[PDB]
């Protein structure tokens, strides 16, 4: 897999060879191939040899930052649709940022308007924004589970006409708690707007 | 439209989530005054009202979050677009606690517009793990960038003494004092810094 | 729409005179393929397929001009956004009597993303006058490019070997004797030509 | 540095291969002039100042290539902000065997500033290629830029006659006469040229 090549690169402090890696893939694979066969495999890797202590923070930092800009390159392709925006975030405590772009990214290549806000948005103040701009939908990302426990019952009910949470961290029950629909696989999130 | 205009258009496209028309400006703004200069004239004039505006309670924390992730993308873009050679890199990032990421990555990006090897790592590297990768790449340099003291005042003295052959710190939450304190060279201005490499 | 159909698009973008469909159709292939990538995939594609367009006669000197314009600027802006490294130049130029002057701005390219100080000059510069801004400057290399073989012929035997301490030749117009005949390196690959400085 | 400094300052930079430096000082003179004021006070006294000190030995053709493939390049950006307006086109180039190509560049951004569809196809264009690519587009006027009287002086009577309905020839090099020979209408400021074009006569 050049997944393996990918993170060596990395590792190594080759970024432009990591980058050209990554173009290799993006040709092979196109878009959406590329973060089923390669981005997320190695996110899965970086993670999984920092919990082994295989890898210390700082170069966990670097392939992190390195796939975000990846991300980011594949979500500006895009492009920006017009219409009423739906935003995208990680509810307050939640620092992840990689599952909201993804999510942020399915939406766009679905002509949905997307807006990425980046991680940790209190709520009170995602519920002014989505009214002010008349989103149709607010869309929430959790890897982790306790972001979610520390929430009051109901308090994802009336971000906006729509409210979906996705992540490990989140499952059916937590979601049914606070009042959003759960949502597991990230193609079926442009379906369920009916549009 | 024009060049004395663009920072109060790009402020109100983002502020109406109107990220098409924010990406247009700013291109517009880099195609008037250059990589460098669409830093200081557009860039930077935005985020400090964005964070201006937010001290003052005139907006909310998910109106400047928009703002800051667009400003963090567009200055990752040019960081991309900028050579990256190859030799010793340098490695650039924040002191532990640091979750600030601009001011790094434009001490990153000042250093490979001069042709300086600069690795962004991403903010907030524990110490030892930040020594530990500067000692295995055979990394010349380490660069922090610090927007609040905080951070810096919570590191024991000389804390960042060894981190690589050259240690800098700077960022206005920094000064000559704390960085004296602490075992790294001050510098106030971007501009010195890759002279000073 | 595919990637692999932005090269019909630009072509034909370009051939009805539309450069605000040409410059949005190239900017979705830098998304696409990176900076080094886009040239590869659509600037090259298509200057090839102009040029065999009017070798067919399809169209004119004029339409190809318009093209060989665009993609011109295309490759200044990627140029400025790589950014200059301080350090002894390398200039970079064409033969006399050559005009063309992309394969010259795609070497300046490669070497700045490398971090190489390359000073693209412009097409066509008279050789003592090459000498003396190489010796001037301290430079450390020169890189010539010759797409016609015509200009490289009517040069005297060992006319570029004094130029600068290192002198390189390539471009479909050159190959191994024309650059042994006038004293210069040759090298086929722009890929190679950062590692051989 | 202060605005009286920037034109020395530029050429000095330039002279001596400092391209970082040309740039943030051309970034200066865009802030203290906007956008056409810069070429006013910046870009076209340096290019005339190049000149001079090549006439006055003091430069060779080197030197002279790097600051007007730098000039170019900023009047280049310059040209891409005006924006590319929709309509029949307008043909900007040199006449053949020309290859100075700022005065061109120069046309096309002033008529691109007032609306005008100012397609700019770089220098030393044959004719009959020029023709076919203003009959090609529907182009409704063509604009020749001649710095040098020579390459003018070159082309048969009548040469320049019919490239398009409206066919402007200005520069140093060209003059009422020679216009008239070759069949173009002759113009000497560019801001009056887009007028030129909505009240025809
Ligand atoms: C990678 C990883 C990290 C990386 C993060 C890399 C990055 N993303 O930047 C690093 C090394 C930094 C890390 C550190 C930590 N994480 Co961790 N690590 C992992 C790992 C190995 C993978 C996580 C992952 O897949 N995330 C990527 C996202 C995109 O996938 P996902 O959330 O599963 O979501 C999927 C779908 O739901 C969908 N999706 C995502 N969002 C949405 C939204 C919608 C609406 C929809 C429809 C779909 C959708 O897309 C994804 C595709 O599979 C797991 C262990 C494992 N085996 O999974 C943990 C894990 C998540 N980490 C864990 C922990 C504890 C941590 C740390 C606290 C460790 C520490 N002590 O410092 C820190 C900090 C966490 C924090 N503060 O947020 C725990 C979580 C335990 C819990 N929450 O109950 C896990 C489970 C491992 C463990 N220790 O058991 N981690
Ligand atoms: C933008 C901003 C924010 C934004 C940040 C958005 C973002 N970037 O993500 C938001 C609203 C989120 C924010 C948050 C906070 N910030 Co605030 N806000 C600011 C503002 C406006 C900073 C401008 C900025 O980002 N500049 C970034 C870089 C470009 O600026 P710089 O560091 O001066 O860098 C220059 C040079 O130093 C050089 N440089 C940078 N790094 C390096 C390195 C080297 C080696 C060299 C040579 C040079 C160099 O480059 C720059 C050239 O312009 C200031 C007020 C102001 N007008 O400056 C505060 C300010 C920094 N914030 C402040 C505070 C208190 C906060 C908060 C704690 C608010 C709160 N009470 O919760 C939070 C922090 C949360 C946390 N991490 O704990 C204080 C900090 C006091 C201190 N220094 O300890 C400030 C100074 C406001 C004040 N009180 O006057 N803030
Ligand atoms: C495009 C083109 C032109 C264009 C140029 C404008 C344009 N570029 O669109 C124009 C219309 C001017 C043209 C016309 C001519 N050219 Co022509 N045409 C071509 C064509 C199709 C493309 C090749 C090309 O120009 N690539 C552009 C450059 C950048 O790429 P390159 O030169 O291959 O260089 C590569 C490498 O060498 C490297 N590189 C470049 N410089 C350097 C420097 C260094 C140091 C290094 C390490 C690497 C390096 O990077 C480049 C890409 O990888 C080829 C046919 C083909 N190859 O498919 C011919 C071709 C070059 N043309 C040819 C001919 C015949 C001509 C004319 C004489 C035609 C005529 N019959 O009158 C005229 C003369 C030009 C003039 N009158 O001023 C012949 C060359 C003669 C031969 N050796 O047999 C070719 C090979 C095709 C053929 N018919 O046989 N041409
Ligand atoms: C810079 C310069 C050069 C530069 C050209 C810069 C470039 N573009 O690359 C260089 C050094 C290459 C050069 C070349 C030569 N040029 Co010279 N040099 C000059 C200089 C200083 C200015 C030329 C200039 O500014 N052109 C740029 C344009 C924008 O200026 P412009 O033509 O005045 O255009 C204005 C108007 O005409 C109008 N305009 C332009 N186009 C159009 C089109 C239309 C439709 C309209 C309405 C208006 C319009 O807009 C412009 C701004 O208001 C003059 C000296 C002087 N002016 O006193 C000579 C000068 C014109 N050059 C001269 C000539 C002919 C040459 C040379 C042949 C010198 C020689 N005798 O050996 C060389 C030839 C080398 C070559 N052919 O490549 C001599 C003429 C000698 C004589 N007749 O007595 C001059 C007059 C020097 C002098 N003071 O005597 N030159």
């Given at each position: ?34 973060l089923?066969?390669?981005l997320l495999?190695?996110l ?20 992190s930052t390195?796939l975000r800009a990846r991300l980011q390159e594949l979500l500006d392709?895009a ?9 995208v975030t990680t509810?307050?405590?939640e620092?992840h940022e990689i599952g909201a772009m993804l999510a942020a990214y399915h939406l766009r290549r679905?002509?949905?308007?997307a807006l990425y806000l980046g991680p ?19 869309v929430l990302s959790?890897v ?22 996705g992540g ?18 990230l ?9």
């Amino acid at each position: 897999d050049l997944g393996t090549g990918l993170l060596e690169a990395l590792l190594r402090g080759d970024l432009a060879g990591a980058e050209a890696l990554f173009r290799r893939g993006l040709r092979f694979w196109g878009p959406e191939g590329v973060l089923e066969h390669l981005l997320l495999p190695v996110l899965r890797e970086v993670g999984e040899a920092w919990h082994r202590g295989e890898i210390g923070v700082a170069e966990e930092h670097l392939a992190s930052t390195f796939l975000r800009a990846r991300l980011q390159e594949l979500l500006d392709l895009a492009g920006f649709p017009p219409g009423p925006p739906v935003l995208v975030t990680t509810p307050p405590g939640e620092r992840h940022e990689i599952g909201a772009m993804l999510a942020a990214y399915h939406l766009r290549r679905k002509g949905v308007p997307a807006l990425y806000l980046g991680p940790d948005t209190p709520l009170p103040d995602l519920r002014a924004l989505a009214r002010r701009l008349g989103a149709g939908a607010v869309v929430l990302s959790a890897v982790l589970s306790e972001p979610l426990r520390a929430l009051p019952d109901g308090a994802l009910k009336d971000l906006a006409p729509r409210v979906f949470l996705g992540g490990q961290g989140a499952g059916p029950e937590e979601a049914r708690r606070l009042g959003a629909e759960y949502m597991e696989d990230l193609k079926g999130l442009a379906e369920a707007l009916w549009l």
